[PDB]
Design a protein around this ligand. Sequence first.
Ligand SMILES: *[C@@H]1O[C@H](CO)[C@@H](O)[C@H](O)[C@H]1NC(C)=O
Ligand SMILES: *[C@@H]1O[C@H](CO)[C@@H](O)[C@H](O)[C@H]1NC(C)=O
Ligand SMILES: *[C@@H]1O[C@H](CO)[C@@H](O)[C@H](O)[C@H]1NC(C)=O
Ligand SMILES: *[C@@H]1O[C@H](CO)[C@@H](O)[C@H](O)[C@H]1NC(C)=O
Ligand SMILES: *[C@@H]1O[C@H](CO)[C@@H](O)[C@H](O)[C@H]1NC(C)=O
Ligand SMILES: *[C@@H]1O[C@H](CO)[C@@H](O)[C@H](O)[C@H]1NC(C)=O
Ligand SMILES: *[C@@H]1O[C@H](CO)[C@@H](O)[C@H](O)[C@H]1NC(C)=O
Ligand SMILES: *[C@@H]1O[C@H](CO)[C@@H](O)[C@H](O)[C@H]1NC(C)=O
Ligand SMILES: *[C@@H]1O[C@H](CO)[C@@H](O)[C@H](O)[C@H]1NC(C)=O
Ligand SMILES: *[C@@H]1O[C@H](CO)[C@@H](O)[C@H](O)[C@H]1NC(C)=O
Ligand SMILES: *[C@@H]1O[C@H](CO)[C@@H](O)[C@H](O)[C@H]1NC(C)=O
Ligand SMILES: *[C@@H]1O[C@H](CO)[C@@H](O)[C@H](O)[C@H]1NC(C)=O
Ligand SMILES: *[C@@H]1O[C@H](CO)[C@@H](O)[C@H](O)[C@H]1NC(C)=O
Ligand SMILES: *[C@@H]1O[C@H](CO)[C@@H](O)[C@H](O)[C@H]1NC(C)=O
Ligand SMILES: *[C@@H]1O[C@H](CO)[C@@H](O)[C@H](O)[C@H]1NC(C)=O
Ligand SMILES: *[C@@H]1O[C@H](CO)[C@@H](O)[C@H](O)[C@H]1NC(C)=O
Ligand SMILES: *[C@@H]1O[C@H](CO)[C@@H](O)[C@H](O)[C@H]1NC(C)=O
Ligand SMILES: *[C@@H]1O[C@H](CO)[C@@H](O)[C@H](O)[C@H]1NC(C)=O
Ligand SMILES: *[C@H]1O[C@H](CO)[C@@H](O)[C@H](O)[C@H]1NC(C)=O
Ligand SMILES: *[C@H]1O[C@H](CO)[C@@H](O)[C@H](O)[C@H]1NC(C)=O
Ligand SMILES: *[C@H]1O[C@H](CO)[C@@H](O)[C@H](O)[C@H]1NC(C)=O
Ligand SMILES: *[C@H]1O[C@H](CO)[C@@H](O)[C@H](O)[C@H]1NC(C)=O
Ligand SMILES: *[C@H]1O[C@H](CO)[C@@H](O)[C@H](O)[C@H]1NC(C)=O
Ligand SMILES: *[C@H]1O[C@H](CO)[C@@H](O)[C@H](O)[C@H]1NC(C)=O
Ligand SMILES: *[C@H]1O[C@H](CO)[C@@H](O)[C@H](O)[C@H]1NC(C)=O
Ligand SMILES: *[C@H]1O[C@H](CO)[C@@H](O)[C@H](O)[C@H]1NC(C)=O
Ligand SMILES: *[C@H]1O[C@H](CO)[C@@H](O)[C@H](O)[C@H]1NC(C)=O
Ligand SMILES: *[C@H]1O[C@H](CO)[C@@H](O)[C@H](O)[C@H]1NC(C)=O
Ligand SMILES: *[C@H]1O[C@H](CO)[C@@H](O)[C@H](O)[C@H]1NC(C)=O
Ligand SMILES: *[C@H]1O[C@H](CO)[C@@H](O)[C@H](O)[C@H]1NC(C)=O
Ligand SMILES: [Ca+2]
Ligand SMILES: [Ca+2]
Ligand SMILES: [Ca+2]
Ligand SMILES: [Ca+2]
Ligand SMILES: [Ca+2]
Ligand SMILES: [Ca+2]
Ligand SMILES: [Ca+2]
Ligand SMILES: [Ca+2]
Ligand SMILES: [Ca+2]
Ligand SMILES: [Ca+2]
Ligand SMILES: [Ca+2]
Ligand SMILES: [Ca+2]
Ligand SMILES: [Ca+2]
Ligand SMILES: [Ca+2]
Ligand SMILES: [Ca+2]
Ligand SMILES: [Ca+2]
Ligand SMILES: [Ca+2]
Ligand SMILES: [Ca+2]
Ligand SMILES: [Ca+2]
Ligand SMILES: [Ca+2]
Ligand SMILES: [Ca+2]
Ligand SMILES: [Ca+2]
Ligand SMILES: [Ca+2]
Ligand SMILES: [Ca+2]
Lengths: 540, 540
Amino acid sequence: DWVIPPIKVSENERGPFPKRLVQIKSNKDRFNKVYYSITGQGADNPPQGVFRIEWETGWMLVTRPLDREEYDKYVLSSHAVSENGSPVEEPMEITINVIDQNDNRPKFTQDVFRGSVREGVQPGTQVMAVSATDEDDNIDSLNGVLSYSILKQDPEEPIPNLFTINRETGVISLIGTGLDREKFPEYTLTVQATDLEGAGLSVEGKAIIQITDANDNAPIFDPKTYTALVPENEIGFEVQRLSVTDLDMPGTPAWQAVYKIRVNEGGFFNITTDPESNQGILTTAKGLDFELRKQYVLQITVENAEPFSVPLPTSTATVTVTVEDVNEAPFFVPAVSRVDVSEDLSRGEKIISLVAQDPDKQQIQKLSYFIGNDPARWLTVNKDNGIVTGNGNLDRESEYVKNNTYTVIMLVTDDGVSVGTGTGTLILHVLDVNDNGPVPSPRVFTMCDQNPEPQVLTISDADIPPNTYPYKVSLSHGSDLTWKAELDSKGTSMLLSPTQQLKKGDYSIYVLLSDAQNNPQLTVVNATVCSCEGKAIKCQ
Amino acid sequence: DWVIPPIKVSENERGPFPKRLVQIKSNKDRFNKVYYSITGQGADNPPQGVFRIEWETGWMLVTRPLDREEYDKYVLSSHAVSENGSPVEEPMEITINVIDQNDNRPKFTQDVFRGSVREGVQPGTQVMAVSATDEDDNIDSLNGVLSYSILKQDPEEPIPNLFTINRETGVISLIGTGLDREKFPEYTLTVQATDLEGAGLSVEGKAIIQITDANDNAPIFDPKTYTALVPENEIGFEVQRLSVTDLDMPGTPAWQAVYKIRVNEGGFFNITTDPESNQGILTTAKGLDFELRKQYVLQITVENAEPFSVPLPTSTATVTVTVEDVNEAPFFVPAVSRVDVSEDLSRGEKIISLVAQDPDKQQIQKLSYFIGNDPARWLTVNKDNGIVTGNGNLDRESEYVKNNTYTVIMLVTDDGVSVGTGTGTLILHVLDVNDNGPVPSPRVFTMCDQNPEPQVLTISDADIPPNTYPYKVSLSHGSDLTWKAELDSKGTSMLLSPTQQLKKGDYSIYVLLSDAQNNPQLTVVNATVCSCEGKAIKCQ
Ligand SMILES: *[C@@H]1O[C@H](CO)[C@@H](O)[C@H](O)[C@H]1NC(C)=O
Ligand SMILES: *[C@@H]1O[C@H](CO)[C@@H](O)[C@H](O)[C@H]1NC(C)=O
Ligand SMILES: *[C@@H]1O[C@H](CO)[C@@H](O)[C@H](O)[C@H]1NC(C)=O
Ligand SMILES: *[C@@H]1O[C@H](CO)[C@@H](O)[C@H](O)[C@H]1NC(C)=O
Ligand SMILES: *[C@@H]1O[C@H](CO)[C@@H](O)[C@H](O)[C@H]1NC(C)=O
Ligand SMILES: *[C@@H]1O[C@H](CO)[C@@H](O)[C@H](O)[C@H]1NC(C)=O
Ligand SMILES: *[C@@H]1O[C@H](CO)[C@@H](O)[C@H](O)[C@H]1NC(C)=O
Ligand SMILES: *[C@@H]1O[C@H](CO)[C@@H](O)[C@H](O)[C@H]1NC(C)=O
Ligand SMILES: *[C@@H]1O[C@H](CO)[C@@H](O)[C@H](O)[C@H]1NC(C)=O
Ligand SMILES: *[C@@H]1O[C@H](CO)[C@@H](O)[C@H](O)[C@H]1NC(C)=O
Ligand SMILES: *[C@@H]1O[C@H](CO)[C@@H](O)[C@H](O)[C@H]1NC(C)=O
Ligand SMILES: *[C@@H]1O[C@H](CO)[C@@H](O)[C@H](O)[C@H]1NC(C)=O
Ligand SMILES: *[C@@H]1O[C@H](CO)[C@@H](O)[C@H](O)[C@H]1NC(C)=O
Ligand SMILES: *[C@@H]1O[C@H](CO)[C@@H](O)[C@H](O)[C@H]1NC(C)=O
Ligand SMILES: *[C@@H]1O[C@H](CO)[C@@H](O)[C@H](O)[C@H]1NC(C)=O
Ligand SMILES: *[C@@H]1O[C@H](CO)[C@@H](O)[C@H](O)[C@H]1NC(C)=O
Ligand SMILES: *[C@@H]1O[C@H](CO)[C@@H](O)[C@H](O)[C@H]1NC(C)=O
Ligand SMILES: *[C@@H]1O[C@H](CO)[C@@H](O)[C@H](O)[C@H]1NC(C)=O
Ligand SMILES: *[C@H]1O[C@H](CO)[C@@H](O)[C@H](O)[C@H]1NC(C)=O
Ligand SMILES: *[C@H]1O[C@H](CO)[C@@H](O)[C@H](O)[C@H]1NC(C)=O
Ligand SMILES: *[C@H]1O[C@H](CO)[C@@H](O)[C@H](O)[C@H]1NC(C)=O
Ligand SMILES: *[C@H]1O[C@H](CO)[C@@H](O)[C@H](O)[C@H]1NC(C)=O
Ligand SMILES: *[C@H]1O[C@H](CO)[C@@H](O)[C@H](O)[C@H]1NC(C)=O
Ligand SMILES: *[C@H]1O[C@H](CO)[C@@H](O)[C@H](O)[C@H]1NC(C)=O
Ligand SMILES: *[C@H]1O[C@H](CO)[C@@H](O)[C@H](O)[C@H]1NC(C)=O
Ligand SMILES: *[C@H]1O[C@H](CO)[C@@H](O)[C@H](O)[C@H]1NC(C)=O
Ligand SMILES: *[C@H]1O[C@H](CO)[C@@H](O)[C@H](O)[C@H]1NC(C)=O
Ligand SMILES: *[C@H]1O[C@H](CO)[C@@H](O)[C@H](O)[C@H]1NC(C)=O
Ligand SMILES: *[C@H]1O[C@H](CO)[C@@H](O)[C@H](O)[C@H]1NC(C)=O
Ligand SMILES: *[C@H]1O[C@H](CO)[C@@H](O)[C@H](O)[C@H]1NC(C)=O
Ligand SMILES: [Ca+2]
Ligand SMILES: [Ca+2]
Ligand SMILES: [Ca+2]
Ligand SMILES: [Ca+2]
Ligand SMILES: [Ca+2]
Ligand SMILES: [Ca+2]
Ligand SMILES: [Ca+2]
Ligand SMILES: [Ca+2]
Ligand SMILES: [Ca+2]
Ligand SMILES: [Ca+2]
Ligand SMILES: [Ca+2]
Ligand SMILES: [Ca+2]
Ligand SMILES: [Ca+2]
Ligand SMILES: [Ca+2]
Ligand SMILES: [Ca+2]
Ligand SMILES: [Ca+2]
Ligand SMILES: [Ca+2]
Ligand SMILES: [Ca+2]
Ligand SMILES: [Ca+2]
Ligand SMILES: [Ca+2]
Ligand SMILES: [Ca+2]
Ligand SMILES: [Ca+2]
Ligand SMILES: [Ca+2]
Ligand SMILES: [Ca+2]
């Protein structure tokens, strides 16, 4: 058909109501009276009564103002019946479009936006982002397009133009330079959005930016030069602690100190760090020792764990140390294999005039010499002059003496001012003299009767050679009660044989030898005889 | 709206009734049950029940056959109410048109049409006009248009195609030739009219034509030659009547005869016409007279009053007349101043031998002569010979005779066969003779005594001159008793005087005269005298 165009109507209209929109006519009215009515939402349906028609003229009206924001369009159905009561025309659809008007102010997405950036970054860096909206049209008008802006950053210091915002997108960026968490950490700037691309109505928001941290700062010592005293030897011990103040953020690696000495003399120092006021705690690496050095001039520089965000001054601490003195024990010089001395020494004679030395050249402390180790008592010391003399009777020949030795240990004490011990061994070579003289091996026989065979006997000397070289056998009172002497060819033994057919048991034979001579006297080597033929038998 | 088209329905429909026309639906039926009804003429209004609707389906039906001729259209109103009882749709107008069907035969305007035309007219002449009608449509179909025609003229003689009719208009015209009122005056022809321009149904009428009259005919005499007898003189009189027969229409000028003679001899004839059988009535114009003519051959032609509608033969009647004779009176020839005759005629002498003449030469009829007029008896006639003689004594001298005349009239009579008179005057010159003689004037005197003066006396003669010429006086016995005679110079008188002194009265004197002589004797002229002197005095 020839339909009927949609009807545009403005919003928030205002004048004298009613307002005729249009007029409709059924031509089938030649016959009876026609009754015009109309139906739909806004008509008889909810919102009832916005539009109504004059049953007799065919006029359509808007009865009151409208807000497209509420309902932006309506569709209606129109009718025409006869007085008799019958419909005449197939109904007719009707449309109305509600044209937008700038009745709406915009509104920010949130009531407050927050942001953060680091202090050391470069100009032209994107920080935050902000939103807002207008409910009016924005597809055929500007009643709903906004334009963003900024008008007041607080801390109007260092300067007041650190940022800008993209008018269309509302994004903010760092424009200037001079950000420092250490002086001004959080800005609060006021934003506004406007109707018709900055032309219409405006509103406010608030965005707040916190500033991350940077290693803008270096560490600073609170003393620059310290001093402490120290002892030579127990040690590995705490000398002095140090103080400092970095200014970036505390629990952070831009706040933790790292040290080191420049030069470690004997490399006898270690230094650690501590999460207190991360003071510098210095200590001794390997004890000290001395009388060698009293002075210690060393320097320690301090850094952070992480590198610096800028060239900065490295700052050292210069420190002086002094070693207190402890006084140590003295010592005999050697451990003496000294005196190759003979057995004939006169009880009270100079053996070893000895001396001991003591470390501490503070030496105005003497000591006393004491002896100590010990198989039995011979020797003697002058305690205030360390003089070892030889008292007593010695005898290389016999008991304690093991290999050609006699080892003895002695002491010495550090007095004068405190304490001390000195353990020193002393081996002294004893010597030989020909003391003893020759002696027979077996002392009792068992001779036989009829024809006894030679009674083997031998010789032994306690002395050391030559002193036991060859012999000379001799028979004293009974050199004839019949007894005849004899030597083995290979030196050592002697052959003892009677020369008479003598008696039934129990009787001695006086013996007498010599080796350089010395002559011993020996003696009786008794002789038990019991009935027989010729071989030395078990007796009775 | 989207209305609803008119519904065409045929007429005189026929099949199984009902017949669904259309179905209607209210869409507002989602809510309750809707009740369909319908109203109007043909519905609930007169013709009630032609159409009805099914309250529950919405079907509309035609219940029975229809005739557009009765009602050619219907308009209806449809309704729809809810069960609860409320109307839902404004009613709806409904229309039905009833399409025509050839159910109607045509019909003539009148039951019989009449007409008339004159016999002598020319082919291609409009006569009558005829009408008729069909009641079916004639504006979209041919169910109502007719075509006219003819199929039977009676008097299928002279020929049978004297006319035609205009098929579309129904007008009739003369097509042929030969119309004669005189033989066939009234035709009766049958006409027909037809459906669909001569295609559908047909009917009959009747038209009757009478034929006016024309002067097709001339007049015809019934005798062709007549005869009649006639008398000379009373006259102006009816000779003979004539018969004829024209054949056109009687009371009409195409039936009235007009005559005339060809040649009117002395122009003594008139002829009129008469509304009887309009015979020719001939008569005498001015008496006749004769003995001059006996024969009359004349001719009379006859026409009509109005000219002829065609060349025709003029027909004459030839007629013969004969004049009977009447015999008239005779006549003396003149009226005579004849006879200068003298007074001395001898009683019985020829004066006037006269004759008279009579007209009719049939003359074997004589007459008798009689006299008639009259102062006294002298003359005489021979009656059978007309001879006037003179008997008697005449005398020019005296009484009847006036101027020198004597007039007399006489007669004569026509006998022999019938009657007659003849009046003729007659003057006859009488003559003079000297009869008488002289005579004295006074006859008695009165003379005087002493001295009487002359007594005058005179003379007179009865005669005519010379006969009275001069005198001669004479005195007889007393020529002396004293008396002396005398004449006047101028002739006539005489002087009478005595010569004696004589006596006293009473006495005569004898006188005597003459004129040729004749001599009279006169006489006594007495004389009375009485006393005196000299003048003739009165006496005593
Ligand atoms: C930003 O927020 C802080 C915290 O309240 C406030 O003290 C300061 O004034 C605001 N503006 C700037 C530029 O710091
Ligand atoms: C020396 O060392 C001591 C240790 O107690 C310290 O207090 C002092 O500051 C250092 N410097 C000097 C000059 O004494
Ligand atoms: C670190 O020590 C310096 C030296 O006096 C001082 O100026 C600074 O304020 C100290 N740091 C802090 C946080 O006080
Ligand atoms: C202190 O500094 C030294 C030198 O680098 C390092 O080895 C040590 O681990 C530090 N102490 C601590 C607790 O970090
Ligand atoms: C530390 O060493 C420096 C370098 O010679 C010296 O001046 C100072 O006296 C020493 N000790 C102290 C107490 O500073
Ligand atoms: C000698 O030195 C040895 C080796 O230590 C030791 O066993 C002995 O007791 C010391 N004295 C003597 C008499 O041998
Ligand atoms: C010296 O050392 C000895 C070891 O034999 C010890 O018993 C003694 O206590 C020490 N003397 C002193 C004075 O400290
Ligand atoms: C020295 O004396 C000390 C103290 O008893 C002892 O421990 C040590 O064994 C002794 N000997 C030596 C050779 O120092
Ligand atoms: C040997 O025997 C004798 C005889 O009785 C006796 O006197 C002596 O003591 C014994 N031994 C020695 C070595 O004299
Ligand atoms: C016409 O009418 C006359 C009068 O009745 C009738 O006699 C005649 O037959 C009809 N037809 C004609 C052609 O004369
Ligand atoms: C003569 O006249 C008479 C008159 O009576 C008439 O009857 C007759 O027809 C006429 N013709 C002849 C030849 O007689
Ligand atoms: C007129 O006279 C003629 C002559 O005989 C005749 O033929 C005719 O019929 C007459 N007219 C009439 C109407 O009779
Ligand atoms: C008869 O004919 C004569 C000749 O024309 C005419 O004068 C006369 O009037 C006619 N008579 C009648 C009655 O028409
Ligand atoms: C009439 O006149 C004609 C013409 O001569 C003649 O023949 C006839 O006899 C006359 N009279 C009669 C009686 O016809
Ligand atoms: C003569 O004629 C006259 C004239 O008519 C007449 O009067 C008279 O009577 C006649 N007779 C005589 C005698 O005169
Ligand atoms: C002749 O005429 C006379 C006139 O005087 C008349 O009296 C008479 O009757 C007539 N005679 C005859 C015979 O008719
Ligand atoms: C002749 O006679 C007739 C008949 O009386 C008369 O009338 C007439 O006057 C007479 N006279 C003449 C001259 O005819
Ligand atoms: C005249 O008189 C005389 C005398 O008496 C007488 O006789 C006579 O008659 C008279 N007259 C005449 C004419 O005679
Ligand atoms: C010093 O002592 C600390 C503590 O035991 C140890 O971990 C470190 O290895 C030593 N040396 C250094 C150079 O720090
Ligand atoms: C000082 O030395 C440190 C390393 O010990 C270094 O990191 C720092 O950058 C140096 N100072 C300068 C100004 O370069
Ligand atoms: C510490 O002090 C000493 C002496 O003044 C100097 O040699 C050393 O360089 C100093 N360290 C610093 C960082 O100044
Ligand atoms: C530490 O500081 C001293 C004095 O200020 C300087 O001479 C030395 O070079 C510095 N040490 C380092 C490693 O930077
Ligand atoms: C004594 O000192 C010596 C060094 O000559 C050593 O060999 C020996 O073991 C020491 N003996 C003791 C008990 O100290
Ligand atoms: C005695 O001398 C030997 C050889 O020098 C030596 O090796 C040994 O240790 C010493 N003492 C002993 C009991 O062998
Ligand atoms: C003849 O007589 C009639 C009748 O009086 C008259 O009217 C007519 O004029 C006369 N003459 C003619 C020629 O008809
Ligand atoms: C004969 O004469 C009449 C007039 O008297 C005339 O009207 C008629 O036409 C004539 N006949 C013919 C054939 O012309
Ligand atoms: C009448 O008859 C006479 C004689 O036959 C003739 O001369 C005349 O012409 C006739 N008239 C007619 C019309 O024939
Ligand atoms: C009348 O008829 C006669 C004879 O038929 C004819 O000779 C004559 O010419 C006719 N007269 C007229 C006037 O036609
Ligand atoms: C007689 O006839 C004559 C003709 O001469 C005439 O003059 C006169 O009048 C007539 N008299 C009478 C009485 O007829
Ligand atoms: C006599 O004659 C005269 C003259 O002719 C004439 O005129 C007269 O009529 C006659 N009669 C009379 C009485 O005069
Ligand atoms: Ca709004
Ligand atoms: Ca809006
Ligand atoms: Ca807006
Ligand atoms: Ca900074
Ligand atoms: Ca730092
Ligand atoms: Ca920082
Ligand atoms: Ca030391
Ligand atoms: Ca020391
Ligand atoms: Ca010491
Ligand atoms: Ca010894
Ligand atoms: Ca020895
Ligand atoms: Ca020896
Ligand atoms: Ca019909
Ligand atoms: Ca029809
Ligand atoms: Ca029809
Ligand atoms: Ca005719
Ligand atoms: Ca005629
Ligand atoms: Ca006719
Ligand atoms: Ca005559
Ligand atoms: Ca006659
Ligand atoms: Ca006669
Ligand atoms: Ca006479
Ligand atoms: Ca005479
Ligand atoms: Ca005379």
